[model samples]
Target chain A: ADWEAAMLTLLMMLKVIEKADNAAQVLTALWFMALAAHMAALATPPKLEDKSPASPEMIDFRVGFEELATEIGKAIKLAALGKVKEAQAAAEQLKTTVNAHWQKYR
Target chain B: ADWEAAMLTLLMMLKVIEKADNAAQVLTALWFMALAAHMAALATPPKLEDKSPASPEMIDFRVGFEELATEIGKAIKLAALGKVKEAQAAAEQLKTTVNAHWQKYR
Candidate 1:
């Protein structure tokens, strides 16, 4: 609607400028032309939302890393207490494997 | 209770690993020592929240920009009314001036 009004006004002003006589008329026509051009510039297509920032998925991944760290600690504790010397030995081996995997923290 | 038990077990391990047999004992001692060193590395001071990402202030700034844009159109309408000419002149001139300053949108 705003674009239609602006286009109609610009067409009218273009007709007026074409018919105008003397220097002052020409100057006034030029002013109207400038105003019309400004309106036309505004009438150009609206912008789409530019999604440049980090996405929600990235934020969720950050939260997930923290949760995984906490769960690993709990898994280690459960493994430490489970029955059968050999079963417990397997659990201990698993814990040592995980700890060795994470040994870069050393 | 868990914290106390961890401390007591750690001290006992330090004592046992301190005295044992020969080649196998030395290798075991070094393995336990390595484990103790790793645990100490984990025991460093807890971190306080280092406020990094867009803080509360930044989030407020982002919200405020859209609000200011919405209010500006009302301000332009009030200025266009002839009711406050001098004031409106000042305001309209301000609108033109601001509008001119933002002419890069052209």
Candidate 2:
């Protein structure tokens, strides 16, 4: 009942990315991310209203997820333009980025 | 890349249901199911075009997911009206309905 906004959205987006084969599927990840961002702002425990970016150099839940969403947004656009392979590669990179940031927050 | 339209969308919507705690979150499940239904029409192997509802006594991928989506849609509406407890009961019932059908397809 207490799923984190950070991890919950990440889980949904990662699953969508994992399932991506067409542009619609790649684009699908963003809808979940959109919900995640909204939840992060309002849901508590992490208390994003009181949270910061850890530092100028460190990524917190908000920044990390924003980066992932941006990466996927670009990938969705690329896949839409018929660059499905490149979109997949970027989604692969998104997994890497999430791993680097997930441990601290998750 | 060859994920089933049934399973992939099912995966997404079920995860959303698992994470749902509020009206917005419950509403979120529908978006993924929307995608699932679309993918079922276009993506192949199960070949939805050739498929029917397994004698109208059984639910297929499209029908099963539609049923789940409809259940959640009611929950979302109820939760919006502040009937969250009722909504959750409906969602929990949704899980039961999915289990009854999922084994047949998944």
Candidate 3:
């Protein structure tokens, strides 16, 4: 469930990026990505004692989210330095990764 | 300053904890704290090249915020485990730390 919730947060951040008005809005969206990565790290669903450990898919999902967070932060820093086109390109990369993962896992 | 914005995010998390309607709400608050911590780590104010590295106060502030994030995550886990009293106590401790830090640095 925590994974699902984190995915939802990622989707929300993507939406924010789509309508970002300025560097500030982009920064906020960056924070959302950071939040999602942290959630993926710390809020794993509780497993029963007899259950198996996290599956390969789950591990991959967490890794994907972490990577997305890093890229978004890079994009924000680029935007802050007035490289708007570069920032947008970075965000576009993030969107592609997110969509690919979502289609495969969600 | 990024510190100020991170502090703002922490304050927002505290507000969410105050009005938490369920375990999920508390978990979301935990994510916000994580966001603040990550921002505090990565988004330090761009210092002039002539300026010295981070001062003691800046380091202390970052440590304080990082500790707050960890404690909030712990509290959320406690809440998820149905330990409401323990969770609330942890959150109260976080609030005390945040207030003290805010008074000293903000």
Candidate 4:
């Protein structure tokens, strides 16, 4: 469904969330924040990068990665702020975004 | 570390924890309770069953699986009662037990 490392850490965070104390809550939010930032940095926005030599899939991935990171950032920010319901909704939205483009671009 | 389905539902419950509302909290706890019950049901206690027909590893698994299920049940019961810290402590204990027996039993 996603990269192996991505899925691994993602699951790890999920475990932390369930057992969440105050500290676990903070760390879980931070984990997602860090991941979102990392993905954002890894993405090469086609508008700013030279993608002409890239394959169509790679070119599409650059765009999708940026979009994915943005959605992830949105989820993590709400999570960090303790907007539990809002954050969950955002996460669902991100899930939809992921399901649509993950394999297509990956 | 666990069966694929076990790991999958475990992670899904984790996500529900962070975004927890009153209902999510109740359901998440119930989810673990159900899983613990299922594991316990799957375990064959050697004292009650004939192990002579079973392989050595399978025989060992019967005992280990029961032990694992007991540990899981303890953690989930604490979780269901809103003992977040105690539940986490129980979970850590379960984690240790799993690390030692999961592979041996599997």
Residue pairs in steric clash, candidate 3?
Answer: none
Instruction: Give the best candidate by DockQ.
Output: 3
Q: How would you encode candidate 1's per-residue C-alpha lDDT over A1-106 as one tens digit per residue?
A: 2333544453454455346543333323323333333343333212212332255533333333233323323322332233223223332333343333223122
Q: Can you give the TM-score per candidate against the true fold?
A: 0.23, 0.43, 0.50, 0.35
Error of 1 at B35 (Å): 2.4
Q: Write the per-residue lDDT of candidate 3 for residues B1-106, one digit (tens) a residue.
A: 1555566556666776777777776776666676666666654433322334576655655677677777777887888887766776778788887777667663
Please identify which of the two predictions, 1 or 2, would achieve the higher TM-score against the true structure.
2
- lDDT (Cα, tens digit) per residue for candidate 4, span A1-106: 1132232233334444444555437345435534533433344432334555366755556566566677766667777777766665665555555556534433
lDDT of 1 at A86: 29
Check candidate 2 and list the clashing pairs: none
| Clash pairs, model 4 backbone | none
Point out the higher-scoring one by lDDT: 2 or 3.
Answer: 3
For model 1, residues B15-65, the per-residue Cα lDDT tens digits are 443353333433332333233223222221122134433566334332432
Q: In model 4, what lDDT does residue A56 have? A: 77
lDDT of 3 at A49: 26
The Cα error of candidate 3 at residue A19, in Å, is 6.9
TM-score of 1: 0.23
RMSD of 1: 36.3
Residue-level lDDT of model 4, residues B1-106, one tens digit each, is: 2343453444454445435555326334434533543454355533435556376755565466455555544554455445666656665555555556534433
